[PDB]
Design a protein around this ligand. Structure first.
Ligand SMILES: *[C@](O)(C(N)=O)[C@H](CC1CCC1)NC(=O)[C@@H]1[C@@H]2[C@H](CN1C(=O)[C@@H](NC(=O)NC1(C)CCCCC1)C(C)(C)C)C2(C)C
Ligand SMILES: [Zn+2]
Ligand SMILES: [Zn+2]
Lengths: 181, 22, 16, 151
């Protein structure tokens, strides 16, 4: 079976805001990737090996709202640009890639999986360049090898004239390293 | 700063399925 | 005759 | 929810259709030049190509289009009318070998279905099964390029 994904919104502006403050979220969680929001921005967070990882330049040092109130980060690595909270009860984790495949697939916030060719330790070329706005909101999303395993987490886009031609990502290795730190 | 709030999910584990009739 | 859609398949398996 | 593949049927046989680029494609040997039903009446084919065994009407309701493959992968996956996924190794522009040959009945009625790459993008439309002694070992398919060109 090929990589296919879908999305579902679980709450709107107002519920989001109340929950941001309250820090108590009672919604049931399902899925490998969570669509996350702060009062300033929305992005993604991927659950890999029981840990809900996301991009530091988005989550900052914040806590994640949960059924038991705010949950403090398990890992925070300003330099690796990573943060990770214990994966939410009900989520499903992906596992790291063990095949060094250089044919990756970026799963965007809109549940679209677009191919990117690995061209370095933290880069890949979009076989079909897309405008920046489309990639907006996908930070912290996974880059999967053909088998469906986490190779990395989308961090930034390499673009010009407003079109993303490449992507910069946090390799799944920095996660291991960050946990070990 | 408030907590990061989950406003949605993306599910990869789903497989082709015939949409049930209601 | 005419071609009639008797069902649909969503590849992502979205229940929604 | 919205489906990419529609399960259609005529007076005799039943087969599949796939929406790609806003068009609902299928096999000419299933539909022919036939019209497609709608709550407002039958709607005609926007495309008909007896030669490539290809025909397409404007995508129906409850449907969502599939994206053409851009990665050029040969590790294809066939989707049947029962939603079964069958790995197929691409042997050629219109041919692919099932990784596990299956009895013809298993692929029966699935013509017009999609042939996906490892990213779920459309690579081609299942044209016909190539079976030896009642066993589908490989399959014939119309690449998306023909469709991209046809439209
Ligand atoms: C995600 O955080 C999000 N909100 O979804 C965001 C995704 C981008 C795709 C279009 C927006 N990433 C993001 O904002 C990063 C983040 C800032 C700058 N940034 C960018 O993606 C910027 N690109 C960029 O800086 N690219 C280079 C120069 C530097 C990093 C390596 C690649 C080259 C952009 C906003 C698109 C100009 C951080 C990098 C911390
Ligand atoms: Zn792998
Ligand atoms: Zn592809």
């Amino acid at each position: 079976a090929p990589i296919t994904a879908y999305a579902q919104q679980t709450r709107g502006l107002l519920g989001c805001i109340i929950t941001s403050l309250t820090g108590r979220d009672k919604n049931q969680v399902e899925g490998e990737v969570q669509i996350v929001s702060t009062a300033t921005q929305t992005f993604l967070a991927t659950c890999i090996n029981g840990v809900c990882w996301t991009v530091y330049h988005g989550a900052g040092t914040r806590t994640i709202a949960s059924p038991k109130g705010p949950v403090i980060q398990m890992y925070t690595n300003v330099d690796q640009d990573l943060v990770g909270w214990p994966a939410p009860q009900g989520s499903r984790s992906l596992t790291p890639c063990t095949c060094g495949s250089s044919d990756l697939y970026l799963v965007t916030r809109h549940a679209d999986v677009i191919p990117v060719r690995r061209r370095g330790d933290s880069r890949g070329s979009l076989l079909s360049p897309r405008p920046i706005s489309y990639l907006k909101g996908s930070s912290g999303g996974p880059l999967l090898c053909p088998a469906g395993h986490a190779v990395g987490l989308f961090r930034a886009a390499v673009c010009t004239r407003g079109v993303a031609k490449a992507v910069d990502f946090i390799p799944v290795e920095n996660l291991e390293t960050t946990m070990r730190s | 700063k408030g907590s990061v709030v989950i406003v949605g999910r993306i599910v990869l584990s789903g497989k082709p399925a015939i949409i049930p009739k209601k």
